[PDB]
Amino acid sequence: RPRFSFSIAAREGKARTGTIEMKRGVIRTPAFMPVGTAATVKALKPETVRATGADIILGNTYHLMLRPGAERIAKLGGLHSFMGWDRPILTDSGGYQVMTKQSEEGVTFMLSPERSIEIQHLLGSDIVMAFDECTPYPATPSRAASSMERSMRWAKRSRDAFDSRKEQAENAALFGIQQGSVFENLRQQSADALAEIGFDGYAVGGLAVGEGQDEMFRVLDFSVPMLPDDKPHYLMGVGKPDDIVGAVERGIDMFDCVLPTRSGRNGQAFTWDGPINIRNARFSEDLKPLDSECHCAVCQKWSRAYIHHLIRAGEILGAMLMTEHNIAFYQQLMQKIRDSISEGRFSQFAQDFRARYFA
Amino acid sequence: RPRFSFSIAAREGKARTGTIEMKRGVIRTPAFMPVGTAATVKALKPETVRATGADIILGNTYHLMLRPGAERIAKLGGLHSFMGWDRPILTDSGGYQVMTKQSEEGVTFMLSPERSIEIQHLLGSDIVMAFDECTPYPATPSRAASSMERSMRWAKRSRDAFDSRKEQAENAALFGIQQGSVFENLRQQSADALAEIGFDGYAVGGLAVGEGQDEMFRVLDFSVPMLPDDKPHYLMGVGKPDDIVGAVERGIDMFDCVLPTRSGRNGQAFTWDGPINIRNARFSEDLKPLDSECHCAVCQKWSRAYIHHLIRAGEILGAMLMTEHNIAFYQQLMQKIRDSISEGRFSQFAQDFRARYFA
Ligand SMILES: CNc1nc2c(CCNCC3CCCC3)c3nc(N)[nH]c(=O)c3cc2[nH]1
Ligand SMILES: CNc1nc2c(CCNCC3CCCC3)c3nc(N)[nH]c(=O)c3cc2[nH]1
Ligand SMILES: [Zn+2]
Ligand SMILES: [Zn+2]
Prior knowledge:
The structure is a homodimer. Chain A is an alpha/beta fold. The first copy, chain A, has a single domain, classed as Queuine tRNA-ribosyltransferase-like (TIM Barrel, Alpha-Beta Barrel). Helix content of chain A is about 45%, strand content about 15%. Chain A is built from 16 helices and 15 strands. The first copy, chain A, has helices at about 45-50, 60-65, 70-75, 80-85, 95-100, 115-125, 140-165, 165-170, 185-195, 215-225, 240-250, 260-265, 295-300, 305-310, 315-340, 345-355; strands at about 5-10, 15-20, 25-30, 30-35, 55-60, 90, 100-105, 105-110, 125-130, 175-180, 200-205, 235, 255, 270, 275. In chain A, strand 1 and strand 2 (about 15-20) form a beta hairpin. At the A-B interface, helix 14 and helix 15 of A face helix 14 and helix 15 of B. Bound molecules: ligand AFQ (2 copies) and zinc ion (ZN) (2 copies). Chains A, B: Its EC number is 2.4.2.29. Chains A, B: It comes from Zymomonas mobilis subsp. mobilis (strain ATCC 31821 / ZM4 / CP4). Chains A, B: This is Queuine tRNA-ribosyltransferase. Chains A, B: Pathway: tRNA modification; tRNA-queuosine biosynthesis. Chains A, B: GO terms for molecular function: metal ion binding; tRNA-guanosine(34) queuine transglycosylase activity.
């Protein structure tokens, strides 16, 4: 395999399906990336994450640079070896989660474009995110513009830091992040600056920060077409099933979110008929699986009533089973989206999905 | 298979190795039984418990009768179906863990010999423990005697309750529990009373309650020979690796303990060179597996340094990996004990084990 090759195999409207080939593996797009924190996808062995269908996972830079330390992980052989995941890993740049002392050089809380890129190198990341300033929502246009402009200066710094390190440049990929809050002109300036610099993929940053789905979709409507069509489009931090479907309808190829893992541990199970909270007393004697159609190992073997008991009791197996189901559900969603675009029936799928999910 | 058949295949001194055949499976003896609580072996899927080599697990009566309820579990199909373990289950009688208002009828806190036997029936237990009064340590001889005598009255009540229920009598087995604290004459009276009543197996109760290994071994020395030789001998609540080895040297066939699961979640890992606490800073960059010879999946794939990180971080995968290793270690110990008795070299094994474990 190549360092990086994105190929689009089929299209429907603005939606695309295809593949990213990297040295450590192939990523089917549109892709959902389960999130680790602290070098683990919470409550799952890597082999379980893979069995759900995940092709890539996100590593948590912020946590790891604090514990156990990026240099320690490199000493130990890198994140893949450390945690036992041998397929691609995307790492965020660490600044969204830091967001103490902010300046043009970076932030102390320390992190700069150069140090972020070096930490991701030490971790052995396959997809490296440029270091950016996420812009709070709402933002005035002045503030949005200042932030975006800083982020684009930091994007060039990130590019040059990555390219400076031969090992990294030859084996990893680098994504830039579009800012500009909800303002179309700032989103355009941002897209143009990133395209001039040139990246292997382009994230849409600064969304899912409190604006709500209608506003998120409105900004995606104009923002995603601004990015280079022939590179992947990553919507950071999104999201709920219905958010994913509409974002693919608007040209997004990649997704990450803590929703399935975090809310699973809290009792929320995704189903094709909408989310359920398994702690609810109505499930205490319900012998059906979490979802009626789901192919995961959890739905093949255990009832709602058992998982209800486990979560009510605070048992670790409860978090394990809920998280495996939720991540499997997300992967099954992505598979249905891929197959429906490939068959030219995604718009029908989206409508059918919504009718039933919100029934 | 039969309801219950214990066959001794080989002997060495007082040690025995053999098999218990039951309808749901065969149990290799000497056996270690992982403990659930709340219808789960903490942090493990049943298939993982089986992969470690366990032939039977213990269910936690006390917890289950409170949550989710014994009648609810029966409504749902019984404990085996509920939790997904289709092999034998031993259930304790619930009184050790209760130990509010104690009387000849039983205890309120409610539980009596009859209700304990019925709860174990509702759970669908394969090996049912008689309901007894555990005797605190230390105990005066008067107090020990009174308690033992009550327990033997309750043992007959348990026998008659079990036999009254045809379904239970035909498909499950019933064990009696010897009391008498550390007093040989009371242990003899107890053995004699239980033998007169007749049980499928005999537990040694009332030990591992604070007396220390030397005293535990002294009481086993005279107590186990008092029990019928041709039935299994169960030492309840024992214990550390070294306790297990010496107890098999004294004629014990079955063991249960929370030590491997509970202490695993706390950072303690068993190894052939003695226990280690993985939280210790000395492991932070140690690339070796938890134990150098262990065949478990955890030692094949992850380092001490990773598990150290996980437990320090309070990550659920840490508890999962530590518990799988510890239960696998215990099962490997039992296998070495079985093979060494079968080959007439157990006394050598015991000496070698101790020299290295305490090196
Ligand atoms: C939920 N919304 C959201 N998340 C955003 C994130 C994070 C995406 N997820 C990373 C994981 C979080 C735990 C470890 C890795 C964002 N990140 C960056 N760098 N810039 C954004 O504008 C940015 C914007 C984001 N919006
Ligand atoms: C650790 N020592 C110890 N435990 C004893 C236990 C419990 C054995 N383990 C049962 C599991 C605990 C959680 C759910 C099932 C004892 N039980 C009974 N009935 N009588 C004893 O003398 C008795 C004596 C015991 N001594
Ligand atoms: Zn499922
Ligand atoms: Zn091991």
